[PDB]
Subunit: 404 residues, 3 copies
């Protein structure tokens, strides 16, 4: 029972220690506090009544902002996003391209507005400062960690851009890990519109901050000594719309391509499996088979660990967006398999991160532009950082499965 | 009656004089002629029979080019832009993304073709030359003013690009003002497809040329001494399609974002107004309340000035595209309020300009690239130029309301 | 009969000889072998049983990859690409924007994956080497010719990019000609989805390799002496999706614009023809009238040569994509004219090339970036190279019409 989870946590921490660049330099105050905050944050918002109330309050607000944003998409696509669509096409009346993608545009505009107004900086400063006084992490790395709660891996470091070129390897690694452990407001709204529970997405975003520092500081302890805008609000909103347009277009093409490539891989796997008596072989069977142990380890019941493995595996080998798109159907009454409410929570939490190999190329471009002489360092540390981020998502799922 | 309008005109001119950089350097020939042409142009095409006939003749031609362009969108979107759409979804069968936006693509291609063929240059040279001999404005600023009738603020100066780096501050200011006072062929076709009357759009585009010079030369009189391509027609058309694609994508994302942000602002305003006994508070009430005087001043009947204020206010604080999108419904039998045909004309004319604060950032990039050392000057003069452009749109609306 | 074709071939070769930069330097081994391979390849796959079987086998595979890729578009557009669309809108239920364009995205991703895995390089090396040992063409120009079977004119030279800056004028010209004579995997899948027969598209792509060298070496014989990557497979797929997105967007805007401009040209032609007693005058009549001789010359029956001319003419003056879009309707039971199965094959083959004037601007940018000092040479040789490519497509159509 609750024992299989506390071992899950122990195993995750252990792997990080085994992979550390220097176990003897690990600061127990830093890593102990970091775990304590991620664990307590979970308990607070997933277990204690007052916590559950703040979480549901924040989630309902987010759900309202989303609905407000949909007035814009309704203006652009009209009847193609109305109730009439379900009467005519049934299930296929939900057009993903017009229901989900335009949300990334509206959220980016909104986030850009909140930065111009100083609202983001205000929230980041309080959370980032809380982390550093509690953990002894540097100022710049703590701010980047907090910013990553709300924005993507290449956007979050912008709040400390002048300090990036000269941060320590341990600081730069943490900055990467905070990005890989979290997601971003725009896609969060996307996943929600796909049916993923907002409470889970919000909780996982907040837990990514200490989670990312926890595993960065286990795997890459500090061995050095750290140191230490649009003309108006309308231009801010337009610049945000433009960046989100570009994001929406990219995510759309990636989904058409990746989902297409998986179908082709499955056609090939069936013909190849056939030579070995397994004509039914598919990419989902390999991944389920291969990741079931890990799913079991974080608290998925033995009889659901294999289906859970498919989703977790897909997020790791491809990205969380392709994974969520294959997981969303299991969140509706038309699911091929009815999963426990606890297994749904665990999958939702473990998928909630940008941790995958392709995020390295993105960090090289985006985070690299802030410190062009540190691109060698980013490439070198890329794989470890993806592992760090993966461990953080897994730890959050274990904690969540525990308190549920 | 016709008295409330002639005072409207007087007030608009007066504000410009009050804001001038040097009232004593204002050239009466220049500003008197400029007003005389804008006023007479209106009379000619809105009042005198032969004028009304040329205008309706030009508008019908434009309406035919639009219909021709729709064959291309029909090929791409098929049934989604057919009559069957209205039978199935009713009013929401009109999909804005496929009905309006593709028109920007076709018009840009067409404009690019007419430049390659020398047809644009020919028309610009006649109108621009007529202006300068009549007003004593410089050659380059007069050409830019005429070009702005047909193309956007960043495209119009291209006909005089080699002379821009060295124009006088008064010349550069006029170039900006001609851009802010007008629109462009692509979006004109958009507004028409939305239901805005072509006659009004065309008339306002032509009146923007003297109107923009009028207010530039009132607010920034000349105190210095002024001076003085695609390989084939198919590449021209393709380069124009490509630029219009980019424009269509940007306008679409801006609409999803801005309309979304207004709905969120309204949710917030309702909760905030509620603390003061006004739970019904919205952004449209603030703007209507705030701009009613101005609407009244240009000839909107007292009892329609508040609804007129909403649209005029929205165009000023955001842009004309968001404004037209909220005004278009009042042009159909399904309008929340039936407005006089005179109030519809006045709103249509006063919305017909790129004059807003966000157009400054666009001028900095586009007009700045032609004269990188004059970017400081553009930023400095930005706000005055937006005011100049606003006065020009307002003056055109007053003149139009008068002759109707 | 079969005589009218062998004269077609003779005429095509003759024009090339007449236009040569030096008929006395033409290498008979090179040009004789090149023609022998194009002709024999046709015979092999269009006539001999075993050949027809390999071709239909390769075409069916391609047809399966396409269907696999459509799972991705189905996820993004849902009901708008389902069988229900035809019940509601009938013929107009086929939305080109969602049926055809997303295929360019999936194919680009796939091609990018096959390069990362070394599968493309492997196939190119065998075919390119076969060509050079047989023809005595240089190594680099032979590889570029083979690569052009599968990828576009600006992508194919990438397999020999370090050698491009220093190739001979005859080599550079051949590189251009291989691009103009062929198409690319992405658009091939597009044309197929439009109804064009895959067997024809595949056969024409393979015949473009010797065909392009044949006419390059007739028109620009060698008079000089020739000489002689994404971090992982997921980044490869994403980079390919992104490039194909950009391509899909461009092709879409070009189609809206060009088809729109043709409708406007037709409105104007009707009014102008009217002054000469031909109110029915259209762009298709001019092109059919003007290209009928050429269509007749390649084996189109006298009574179908005029309709065939429309399509061939349109591909030459605009591009093959606009042409295929006007030709596709004649491939369905709802065709305005029922054409012989032989006339359909001939049109399909003669349209199958990037040979048009606009492809020069594209070669300047793409091929020019590989050798910035050779841009002058590319511009100078552009028109001859388009003629060379056109002759290659025409020759392939004649050969095909012969063996059918
Ligand atoms: C959708 C279903 C199909 C899923 C199956 C796909 C599995 C592919 C695994 C990725 O392969 C590796 O990825 C690394 C990450 O990019 C590369 O690191 C190389 O590149 C840099 C990446 O960080 C360096 O950090 C590394 O040290 C190293 O040099 C490495 O070469 C590459 O072989
Ligand atoms: C959709 C409904 C909501 C509507 C409400 C929004 C109202 C916002 C008003 C804009 O605020 C100002 O805009 C100026 C224009 O950009 C800025 O000028 C600054 O920036 C340059 C702009 O030109 C300079 O010209 C100026 O002198 C100045 O420095 C200025 O700082 C900024 O405060
Ligand atoms: C859709 C229905 C309508 C169809 C009718 C359109 C017909 C237009 C024909 C194109 O005109 C020529 O195209 C050349 C190719 O671009 C140009 O070459 C010029 O530009 C370079 C192109 O290669 C050089 O190679 C040339 O030598 C030359 O200087 C040339 O100037 C231009 O006049
Ligand atoms: O704001 C965002 C959204 C997405 N992604 C990338 O796109 C993938 C799919 O969401 C993620 O894993 C991440 O690599 C970002 O980098 N930033
Ligand atoms: O050709 C165009 C079309 C639009 N816009 C910008 O987009 C806004 C919305 O139409 C305008 O106010 C203007 O700022 C341009 O600058 N040029
Ligand atoms: O991969 C591609 C696809 C299209 N095109 C260009 O786009 C036109 C339309 O397909 C072609 O003739 C060619 O000029 C390319 O250059 N490369
Ligand atoms: Na983040
Ligand atoms: Na203009
Ligand atoms: Na090719």
């Amino acid at each position: 029972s609750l024992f299989m989870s506390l071992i899950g946590m122990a195993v995750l921490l252990g792997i990080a220690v085994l992979l550390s660049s220097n176990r003897k330099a690990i600061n127990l105050r830093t890593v102990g506090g970091a775990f304590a905050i991620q664990f307590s944050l979970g308990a607070f918002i997933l277990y204690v009544p007052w916590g559950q109330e703040l979480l549901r309050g924040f989630s309902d607000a987010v759900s309202n902002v989303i609905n407000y944003g949909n007035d814009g998409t309704s203006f652009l696509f009209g009847g193609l996003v109305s109730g009439k669509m379900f009467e005519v096409f049934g299930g296929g009346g939900f057009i993903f391209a017009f229901r989900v993608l335009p949300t990334l545009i509206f959220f980016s505009a909104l986030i850009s507005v909140l930065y111009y107004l100083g609202v983001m900086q205000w929230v980041i400063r309080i959370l980032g400062g809380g982390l550093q006084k509690a953990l002894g992490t540097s100022r710049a790395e703590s701010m980047s960690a907090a910013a990553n709660i709300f924005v993507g891996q290449t956007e979050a470091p912008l709040v400390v851009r002048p300090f990036v070129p000269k941060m320590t390897q341990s600081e730069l690694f943490a900055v990467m890990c905070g990005g890989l452990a979290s997601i971003a407001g725009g896609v969060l709204a996307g996943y929600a519109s796909m049916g993923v529970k907002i409470e889970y997405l919000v909780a996982a975003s907040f837990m990514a901050a200490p989670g990312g520092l926890l595993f960065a500081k286990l795997m890459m302890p500090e061995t050095e000594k750290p140191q230490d805008k649009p003309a108006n609000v309308i231009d801010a909103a337009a610049g945000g719309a433009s960046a989100g347009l570009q994001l929406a277009l990219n995510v759309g093409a990636m989904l058409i391509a990746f989902i297409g490539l998986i179908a082709l891989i499955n056609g090939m796997l069936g013909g190849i499996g056939g030579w070995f008596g397994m004509p039914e072989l598919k990419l989902e069977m390999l991944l389920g088979w291969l990741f079931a142990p890990l799913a079991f380890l974080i608290g998925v019941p033995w009889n659901e660990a294999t289906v859970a493995g498919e989703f977790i595996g897909l997020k790791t080998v491809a990205n969380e967006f392709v994974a969520y798109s294959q997981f969303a159907p299991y969140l509706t009454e038309a699911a091929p398999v009815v999963l426990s409410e606890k297994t749904k929570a665990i999958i939702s939490f473990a998928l909630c991160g940008f941790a995958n190999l392709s995020s390295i190329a993105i960090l090289l471009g985006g985070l690299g532009s802030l410190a062009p002489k540190r691109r060698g360092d980013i490439a070198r540390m890329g794989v470890k950082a993806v592992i760090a981020g993966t461990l953080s998502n897994l730890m959050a799922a274990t904690i969540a499965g525990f308190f549920l």
